[PDB]
């Protein structure tokens, strides 16, 4: 009766719970969940939604290893049996539409960066819609209605491609390590810009000097290979990923004739930096004809999408 | 009067010469060019073209440093002044059309891989045409006629991106080192395949298990990080590049409604392996609706494109 749905990845579980407005039972349940969370201590409450009717919504994440403890209290779930599975993407969609239709407590679930500061975007009649899911790789979904959507393409250069490389480039233990490393790096030391070839704008084919002519182009020169810092390659690594994703997304929006491109995925959660670089990139490839949109509950959509398949 | 046009890059010069059918002067010129080439000794003659009227064509390459010696006998030319420049791409186009219109001594200048072995392709009415130029980066040209064409997009992941990385991944001194390294590597040790997530085909969104889910996806696991050989990453590096290029090219062919996609660039010269991986990739993204085409004089087109701007 306490309604909920879990997003089970290979390292983490994302979960949404509906707190109805018995009382003692939920409380004691809440008390020992407080135990475990304060164990972990050695923004999830920011995204709580109140006074919403559903025929509160709380949002939490915790290691998959912590999950079996709750019994006494996607890709990951098949190996945790050690329930009925549901397609992450189907749950991503159903979940996404719901929250965006219900708003964020009278504020907007969808937003973008104006240029840069963040600003909202009414997305209440969202069809059609281009959803770019960035996990280890990227899958692009063209959504036409609540009951129709399909994966029209993808790229193998996603999150697993960035951390995968930076770990090889930097010895970085974790993702946020690479992020904050990237956050301090400068890509131009690694990549070759347009002006690195022509001295300036390639005006003939409408190319500015500041565009990236070659990812890691300057790393063919041992001179500059010794001269590049860990953080730059961390930075250099992420730039390429984002720029390529923006390019594919833009080409997709053109072919599928969709003007709204929202980015999601477990990859977008820890830092807004990932988000901004996509925003700059989609801006460049669509030449401003496309804005990038993002969601505040990015990461729990699968979780809630699982919540609404509940059988009664 | 001995007509010729040079392609001057930052490391090499590509040059085409028209041997008309005086005789002593060309001979002695030829003799001391034989000197220098036999100095270097410490397929260019295969591409010679004979009995062609032009209102023989010989094809040669040599280090830019060797060039000034000939006086007594693109990007690179501006720094060699130490003539009138001409846009490499304009010369690429003019050069390409010419040779493909004139055939290859009664054999085909254009070919593709049948599936894999190589087989020819009549390309005598080539408009429209998608030319994918892979240098340090990739520029895609949509050609509509001999006098009309424009760069419709590009990607920053080209040759400079591959050697750039492998050098950082492998300590490889040169390109052919990385190539033959790649030639011995296996990418699956680095990248995460579809089946690495679902155990098999993702049949729901029509995804086979053997597709690459994440470039270097398996390199987030230190286990597999120690377990990957230099050659695989060399291999792993090239796969991603080719697959991304095929994807962009395919999306471009769709939007520009061109069915013929030919690949060129200094990057395609040393090995057919680069070529085959593009052929497999364009095959996958267009689902066989597109074949990849290649040229036998790939690399001298700029050179000859410069030959036909000669003023008289
Ligand atoms: C005749 C000539 C014919 C020619 C032939 C062609 C020749 C060759 C040519 C090929 C050419 C290309 O293959 S091009 C390749 C193109 N590939 C694509 O488009 C795929 C792009 N990538 C994607 O679409 C998406 O990454 C995928 C594949 C849907 C995967 O979704 P994702 O968002 O990447 O999912 P992922 O990041 O793995 O995370 C899933 C969650 O489940 C968890 N998980 C996943 N797997 C597991 C597991 N095994 N155990 C436990 N947990 C797991 C993860 O941890 C994650 O949870 P969290 O860690 O976030 O908590
Ligand atoms: C308000 C919100 C607004 C938003 C703002 C946007 C925020 C940020 C967003 C950005 C986003 C992107 O920038 S995405 C970047 C996309 N960029 C592209 O599409 C460019 C892709 N790459 C390309 O198109 C081509 O690589 C390029 C740029 C035409 C260069 O042609 P390439 O075939 O790469 O030429 P390359 O390989 O350098 O070789 C040229 C020859 O000249 C030689 N050479 C070149 N440079 C030199 C030199 N300096 N000295 C001597 N020789 C040289 C080379 O050696 C080579 O000869 P060889 O070595 O073959 O003998």
UniProtKB/Swiss-Prot annotation, chains A, B:
Highly expressed in the liver. The keyword Metal-binding does not apply. Changing residue 211 to F: Loss of catalytic activity but can bind ATP normally. The active site is at 88 (proton acceptor). GO terms for biological process: coenzyme A biosynthetic process; phosphorylation. Its EC number is 2.7.1.33. Pathway: Cofactor biosynthesis; coenzyme A biosynthesis; CoA from (R)-pantothenate: step 1/5. SUPFAM superfamilies: Actin-like ATPase domain (SSF53067). It is an enzyme of class 2 (transferase). Subject to allosteric regulation, exists in two distinct conformational states, a catalytically incompetent (or open) conformation stabilized by the binding of acetyl(acyl)-CoA, and a catalytically competent (or closed) conformation stabilized by ATP-binding. Inhibited by acetyl-CoA and its thioesters which act as allosteric inhibitors and compete with the ATP-binding site. Inhibited by sulfonylureas and thiazolidinediones. Activated by oleoylethanolamide, palmitoyl-carnitine and oleoyl-carnitine. It holds the Pfam family Fumble. Changing residue 151 to W: Increases affinity for ATP and decreases affinity for acetyl-CoA. Increases acetyl-CoA production. Keywords: ATP-binding, Coenzyme A biosynthesis, Cytoplasm, Kinase, Nucleotide-binding, Transferase. It comes from the Eukaryota. GO terms for molecular function: acetyl-CoA binding; ATP binding; pantothenate kinase activity; protein homodimerization activity; vitamin binding. PANTHER family: PANTOTHENATE KINASE, PANTOTHENATE KINASE 3. Homodimer. Catalyzes the phosphorylation of pantothenate to generate 4'-phosphopantothenate in the first and rate-determining step of coenzyme A (CoA) synthesis. This is Pantothenate kinase 3. The gene is PANK3.
């Amino acid at each position: 009766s306490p309604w909920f749905g879990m997003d089970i990845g290979g390292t983490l579980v994302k979960l949404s719970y509906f707190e109805p407005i018995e009382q003692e039972e939920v409380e004691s349940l809440k008390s020992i969940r407080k135990y475990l969370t304060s164990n972990v201590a050695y923004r999830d409450v920011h995204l709580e939604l109140k006074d919403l009717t559903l025929f509160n919504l709380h949002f939490i994440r915790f290691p998959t290893q912590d999950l079996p403890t709750f019994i006494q209290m996607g890709g990951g779930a098949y190996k945790f049996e050690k329930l009925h599975k549901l397609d992450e993407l189907d749950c991503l969609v159903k979940g996404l539409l719901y929250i965006d239709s219900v708003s964020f407590n009278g504020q907007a679930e969808c937003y973008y960066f104006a240029n840069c500061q963040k600003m909202p975007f009414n997305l209440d009649d969202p069809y059609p819609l281009l959803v770019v899911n960035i996990g280890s790789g990227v899958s692009i979904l063209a959504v036409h209605s609540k009951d129709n959507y399909k994966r029209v393409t993808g790229t193998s250069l996603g999150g697993g491609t960035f951390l995968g490389l930076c770990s090889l480039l930097t010895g970085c233990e974790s993702f946020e390590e690479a992020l904050e490393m990237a956050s301090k790096g400068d890509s131009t030391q690694a990549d070759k810009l347009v002006r690195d070839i022509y001295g300036g704008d390639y005006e003939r084919f409408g190319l500015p000097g500041w565009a990236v002519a070659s990812s890691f182009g300057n790393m063919i020169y041992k001179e500059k290979r010794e001269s590049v810092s860990k953080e730059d390659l961390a930075r250099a690594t992420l730039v390429t990923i984002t720029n390529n994703i923006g390019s594919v997304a833009r080409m997709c929006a053109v072919n599928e004739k969709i003007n709204r491109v929202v980015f999601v995925g477990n990859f977008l959660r820890v830092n807004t930096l990932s988000m901004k670089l996509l925003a700059y990139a989609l801006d460049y490839w669509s030449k401003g004809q496309l804005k990038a949109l993002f969601l505040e509950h990015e990461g729990y959509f699968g979780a809630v999408g699982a919540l609404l398949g509940l059988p009664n």
